[PDB]
Amino acid sequence: TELQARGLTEKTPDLSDEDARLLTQRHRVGKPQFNRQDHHKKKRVSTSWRKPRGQLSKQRRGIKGKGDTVEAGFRSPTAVRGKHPSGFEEVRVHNVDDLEGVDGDTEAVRIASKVGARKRERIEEEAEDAGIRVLNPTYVEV
């Protein structure tokens, strides 16, 4: 009578102490939006980042308040870079064969959006049986 997600939805990965420390760091520190300069002043100017090149650009000149300029120093910790907020490493999956070789303790799987309902069902049931979590599960009424 209610919606229930298929699979090991509550499953958490197991991480070394250092990795969970680093993962927690990333989450606490965050980063600036890094949106393009003045994207908010002109609709024709989108948010996507572009290096400010004006010789007089306030941002390019690093004037405080004109937003941060992309630099390597803003990089996330090597050990956690790319991990799902849960700690898992994602594995893009298109069919049942893609599930092979996937460590359900360390990795979770994401079913490509193009995959249809029929194949998703099969992927979702065999992924669960392999102990693998599906980040984007189907919600059936049970």
Place this chain on the structure above:
Amino acid sequence: GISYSVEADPDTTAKAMLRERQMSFKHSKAIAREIKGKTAGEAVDYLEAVIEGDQPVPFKQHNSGVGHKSKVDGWDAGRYPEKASKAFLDLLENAVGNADHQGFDGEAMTIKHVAAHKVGEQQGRKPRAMGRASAWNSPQVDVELILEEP
């Protein structure tokens, strides 16, 4: 053209529309704004008083240069848009008629929804001095109305 922008329960609702009317779109926002919430019958009486010139239609947004009117309450600028008013009478005549053919008491129904939409312009061209011409267009208006049982 438009489609009803508001949902309406067929069992306690009556609908009506005007299509591509060549009349002031600005006068229509004003009229719609003013008669919403009124009774179909109240709306009709109101509009005839506007046409007659005894009742002003508040012009709250498109009021540049418009002269104040004593009868306008809580505001100052107003006019007597007879053309658009006549078109709305047609709209109400239709709505109330539909309403009756369905068993309701048309006149007593409330104007739950009424809105005007500019659907285009009948393009025109006016010859000007120096061998040039400029636009001379006519607005085309659509308007929806949803009556509802009290």
Place this chain on the structure above:
Amino acid sequence: AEFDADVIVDARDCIMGRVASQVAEQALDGETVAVVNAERAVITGREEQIVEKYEKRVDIGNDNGYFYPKRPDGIFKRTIRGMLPHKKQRGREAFESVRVYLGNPYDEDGEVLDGTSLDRLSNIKFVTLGEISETLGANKTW
């Protein structure tokens, strides 16, 4: 009429600027202050020059306007406002929780703030706010 002042200050024979500076600081700390006997507040210096300054302020102006008070009432209040960011929310709140009075409409005798009193016995060059207002043309309503 009726002002729940957490503090009642007596300006009689006190240095206006030094009183104001302290009344400003307290109002910004959340205190409701009332300055009493403004007309008897004093300012050091050569009366001739002092008066010239205030007379200049009265004369200054234009269509935009420069409303400067002549009564010892406002003179004092304008002095305080000059020590508060009266255009900011916080500033305007503090300023509005401070009122100056001619004489003392309270029952309690105000207190004298430290370092604000002027010893008439060792000082001859100074003036009374009331004297200034009379010079400015005010109506001695006290």
Place this chain on the structure above:
Amino acid sequence: YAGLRTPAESFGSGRGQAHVPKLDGRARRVPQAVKGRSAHPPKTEKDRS
């Protein structure tokens, strides 16, 4: 000759307009103009071997 088949000319300064070749009050030829030539197009002469 795609986009070059026209005698369009530029009015130059004077009418609050950009110096763009026009014909019958319609911009032409130049690459930034709709129906204009292609600046650096595919070329038959290119050795693709």
Place this chain on the structure above:
RNA sequence: UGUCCCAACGUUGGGCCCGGUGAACUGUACAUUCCAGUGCGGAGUCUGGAGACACCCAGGGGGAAGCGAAGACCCUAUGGA
């Protein structure tokens, strides 16, 4: 002899309000300003103060170094006629 002293009253068409018709110029953004200062030395927007409840109608045009025109003067180009 209303050109002037020195302006008045009047006539007609507008102007103003109402119905209908219905453009254009112009628009980086923000914008209720004023006085001073500062700044590429001629600021609604910086700095300090002052003033400032919102919206609307009519006006005569002080400012936006107002709009309009890639200065027609002057110089420069191994330019043109």
Place this chain on the structure above:
RNA sequence: CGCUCUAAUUGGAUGGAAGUAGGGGUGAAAACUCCUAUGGACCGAUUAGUGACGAAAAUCCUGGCCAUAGUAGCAGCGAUA
């Protein structure tokens, strides 16, 4: 990093492709990805190629659209109807 089309290898789609709207996650970032709705037939990935391959600007070009504004004009003419 992203775009087009070619090739090899290899996948997805009417149990709903691309696109679009709103929303969730990742990447310093170019950008990648998911969810919901819409849509109703196409769509990728890796590797090696290919090139009329990336826009905020040019008084840029074309089209569309807002303010201007219910504003100016629909009075002026020795033919005031």
Place this chain on the structure above:
RNA sequence: ACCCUCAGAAGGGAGGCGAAAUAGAGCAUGAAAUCAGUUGGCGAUCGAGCGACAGGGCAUACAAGGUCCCUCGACGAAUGACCGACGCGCGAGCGUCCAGUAAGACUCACGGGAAGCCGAUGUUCUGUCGUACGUUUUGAAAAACGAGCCAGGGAGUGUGUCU
């Protein structure tokens, strides 16, 4: 189609077809600028590059994020005390000891708590910084030049030779 409405072969209402009429005639999809109505936030005593980063209010169906709050305790870089004891200084105050102790960001563990609750998103308030962008220029917020807004279009290419 039929019926009601209407000056009406218009339009509208009701209805019928089809998987779909939000496929109904310049009719696939249906972006932005932008318009009507409406929802959330602000709002008729208050100040202008419109924001970035902090932090509060109010608002939020699910999904695709799941964290967050307080007691206590563990760990604890740099830094680093009060009080009290003694000794100086005209004085503000300083020295020695207490003590590199108490404290000390992050992180974790036990217990307790939140589900509009944490993140996130919309708007708004407070703090700090802040006079667009691009170009010309020794120097641009510039009273130097460009653009009303949006979408789409818009600029190192080919042959030959040489290195």
